[PDB]
Amino acid sequence: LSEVKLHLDIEGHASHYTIPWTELMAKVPGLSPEALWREANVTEDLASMLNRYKLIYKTSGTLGIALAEPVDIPAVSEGSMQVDASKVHPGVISGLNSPACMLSAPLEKQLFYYIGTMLPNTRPHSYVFYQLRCHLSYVALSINGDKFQYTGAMTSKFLMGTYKRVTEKGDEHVLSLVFGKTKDLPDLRGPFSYPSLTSAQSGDYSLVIVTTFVHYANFHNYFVPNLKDMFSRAVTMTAASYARYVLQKLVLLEMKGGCREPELDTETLTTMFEVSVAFFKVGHAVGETGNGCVDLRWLAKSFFELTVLKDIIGICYGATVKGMQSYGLERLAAMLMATVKMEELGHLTTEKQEYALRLATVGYPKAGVYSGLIGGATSVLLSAYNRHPLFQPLHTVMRETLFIGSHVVLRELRLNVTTQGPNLALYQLLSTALCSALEIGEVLRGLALGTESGLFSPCYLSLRFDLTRDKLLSMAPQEATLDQAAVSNAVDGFLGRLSLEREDRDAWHLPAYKCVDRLDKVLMIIPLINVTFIISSDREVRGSALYEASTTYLSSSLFLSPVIMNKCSQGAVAGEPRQIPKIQNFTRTQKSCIFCGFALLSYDEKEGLETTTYITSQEVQNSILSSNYFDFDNLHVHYLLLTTNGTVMEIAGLY
Amino acid sequence: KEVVLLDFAAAGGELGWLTHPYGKGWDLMQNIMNDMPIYMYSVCNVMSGDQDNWLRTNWVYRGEAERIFIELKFTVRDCNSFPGGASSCKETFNLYYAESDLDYGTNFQKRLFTKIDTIAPDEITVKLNVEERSVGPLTRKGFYLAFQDIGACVALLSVRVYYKK
Amino acid sequence: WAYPCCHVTQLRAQHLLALENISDIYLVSNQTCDGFSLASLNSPKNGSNQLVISRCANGLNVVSFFISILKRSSSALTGHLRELLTTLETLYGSFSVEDLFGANLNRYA
Ligand SMILES: *[C@@H]1O[C@H](CO)[C@@H](O)[C@H](O)[C@H]1NC(C)=O
Ligand SMILES: *[C@@H]1O[C@H](CO)[C@@H](O)[C@H](O)[C@H]1NC(C)=O
Ligand SMILES: *[C@@H]1O[C@H](CO)[C@@H](O)[C@H](O)[C@H]1NC(C)=O
Ligand SMILES: *[C@@H]1O[C@H](CO)[C@@H](O)[C@H](O)[C@H]1NC(C)=O
């Protein structure tokens, strides 16, 4: 090389500076000025330069709008253990309750471990940007048969989503959005300026669009984004909240037919960008704290949301995510899961219950499928089901807590076999008890509108199989203020979300499943201690016993097969089915838990099974008895009782 | 008819002209103008003041010439486009010659050159000025030409001498 | 310098200097050239005649080159070296590329 002096006339007369190459080039290896000097066509005739400047789409205008940055990462907690993500020592953190933050200097090194090309030399970028190669993270997906491609590539400083389409003939229409702090945007190359390319800007943030006028025309046929809201949504929200925002859209969409064959419309392409931002905001807020330390509780939540978002983007688009994962955090989280007694996680406050369940799923990659996490999610559900007024729709706070813990469990049902039969089948039993006509009511309403209620329900992971379409229609919101089309849709998705096949998170994990001849004739499966029951219209069953309530002369059947010790038999019991022994000598006042570990079913002769309760505690029993639950005024409704001894007993009256 | 005794611009040209002072005066340059290097001698010391910068030709054989005709082409960037004008910036340069029977080689001496005229461009502001002067009668085996700079911002592009026969 | 306003054309082979033999670069101003961002790349001196080889460069390109060079190497950034970066950015920001449509670009050479 050499050294170069720059003599520049500014203010009328010479001012000269000196550029040392040798010196600069050794302090920052990876600088290649001769490669940059090439990328800048320094002998470009102003004719050729102005032609290529008029190839890039310019933005109308639409200068600044007052947007407030939120408060995402809090200041370090009072006297906190600052954890170096590289040196993750055991015992560093004792308990959950102990304050803890993770040093943000070596954490970003793990999130952004990759090095790849951020700015290619492909046609749309070779004109505007100086080529780049840096530490980065990218989400990348492919739809429409590897023809339309998206790559959201990000650093701690700015995000670039790049859309690309192929037209069955070779051509490639490319459009890229650039989001980040203005001063932190990549270096422009030609005569270009960012104000000409800015589609929205607010208080050191900007959204830049980079594409050809031609390519801009192509996309406008099927992609008209609301770039103002996408900017206002991306700036004003916190990293965790925004992450949840995206994953709800995809989770609700996936329950519909929105991901088996996704379309080239505005919405799906928009959400593709929203997906990338959600990963960017987290890595951004971490990198944007400089050398500091990030509250572990904040990390527990933000990266929980990324883990669930990462998952749904994969089972929905088939997307790949490289980066935004730190082994230091996964080791740190797993450490705190050896602090917790999973048998008694539900005994903690419902904030540390959620702080534990969020570390459980952040720390899964290096935890193993034989960790006692299942018991922790089962514990939380039990403490919740005790403090829940029976047959009511779950509250806002409870439904959120259970949603957090559910992902762990769904990684058992969607995991070929397990060793958690006791706890899993208990969680699936309490889930079957929680979802009643009014829980379903609030879910369909929560689905029709799109609110948080339709995201998760214990009915989703329950053992109920009698939920036909017209069965749900008798439970839907009837309010004219709602849209019946959305309510009709909401039923299908809710019915699509439980269809046993092609879902794979429902069944085939219970050892009592074997004793069923026809698997479509089952109605409900209650596992108790030492027994499970298989309620169905199917007759050919290898249960030990077999009962038939007098269902009606309309409906197929109602059979009750108790499987003893979760072991089936060698042939369907023969001869006319048994009779359910009725019980009148039973008083409404008790002082003991005699129905502990017993399920109490409630069905109708025409409608079918209506309500299920599993009596886990003296409180659950007191609620049933002291309340109006026992209503014999309607002759069509009977109240079976499922013991642990395998007997079914109908209560026809009390004292 | 015109017989060319010296032509700086053309024909495998400059090849030797002498500068005084060495380095802090006139500068030799190269820059493709249509597609080709056209060479020039320029000096712009417009803010240093008290400039006496010399450029001397090679030795030019007189031949038969009584009176030669000296054709000059040059640009002169005006002083106003340098904020501190009319203080140390000039917009002229001086043409001299010196007759000699012998080649004194590199031994330049400035008290042996006689001034011919002051060269001003007649439109100070694409504006490639063309000035022509004649000197006679020439009475030696040959002569030198010299160009004095007093602090202007000048580029000499063509220096063409001839006589009419 | 003594001839600031030149014409930028692609050297298009074997006449380059390629910045290994560049030692001085002159950048014209916003008023010097009627709004043309032109540069002149120079060699230190060649040989006996001591001539300085000069080609004409596209200013906006060469400016944006040094700007990114500095940013790319932001750490070292000695006080005047980062005072160049802000002088270059403002100089680059002083030229308008939308005024280059209502003009002729062969005004020189
Ligand atoms: C440089 O500009 C010329 C036009 O002057 C163009 O033809 C050529 O393709 C450009 N070079 C590169 C590498 O883009
Ligand atoms: C299961 O049944 C056996 C005998 O039938 C009994 O000894 C055992 O205590 C029961 N387990 C529970 C948890 O009730
Ligand atoms: C200058 O260039 C000439 C060729 O034109 C060459 O003879 C001479 O050696 C060069 N000066 C150097 C390399 O110092
Ligand atoms: C010249 O530069 C100044 C700032 O240095 C700016 O205010 C002015 O508008 C520029 N002139 C033109 C014609 O752009």
Residue numbers in the entry:
A (entry chain A): 20 to 674
B (entry chain I): 27 to 151, 161 to 200
C (entry chain B): 24 to 132
What does the paper say about this structure?
However, the receptor for EBV entry into the epithelial cells remained unknown until recently, when the ephrin receptor tyrosine kinase A2 (EphA2) was shown to bind to gHgL independent of gp42. Similar to EBV gHgL, KSHV gHgL also binds to EphA2, to enter endothelial cells. Here we report the crystal structures of EphA2 LBD bound to KSHV gHgL and EphA2 LBD bound to EBV gHgL. The overall structure of KSHV gHgL is similar to that of EBV gHgL. Both KSHV gHgL and EBV gHgL bind the channel and peripheral regions of LBD of EphA2 mainly via gL.
To better understand the entry mechanism, we obtained the complex structure of KSHV gHgL bound to EphA2 LBD at a resolution of 3.2 Å and the complex structure of EBV gHgL bound to EphA2 LBD at a resolution of 3.0 Å. Overall, the structures of these two complexes were similar: both were shaped like elongated rods, about 150 Å in length and 30–55 Å in width. Surprisingly, the LBD of EphA2 bound to EBV gHgL with ~4.12 μM affinity, which was ~230-fold lower than the affinity with which the LBD bound to KSHV gHgL (~17.5 nM affinity). Notably, the KSHV gL residues (V22, Q30, S32, T70, E72, and N128) that form hydrogen bonds with LBD are widely distributed across the four regions, whereas the EBV gL residues (W24, K68, V75, S77, and R78) that form hydrogen bonds with LBD are only located in two regions. Furthermore, KSHV gHgL forms ten hydrogen bond interactions with LBD, compared with only six hydrogen bond interactions between EBV gHgL and LBD. Structural comparisons between the ephrin-A1–LBD complex and the EBV gHgL–LBD complex show that the LBD-EBV gHgL and LBD-ephrin-A1-binding interfaces overlap. Over half of the residues responsible for ephrin-A1 binding are also used for gHgL–LBD binding. We compared the structure of the EBV gHgL–LBD complex with that of the EBV gHgL–gp42-E1D1 complex, and found that the interfaces partially overlap. Thus, the antibody E1D1 competitively bound to EBV gL, inhibiting the interaction between gHgL and its receptor EphA2.
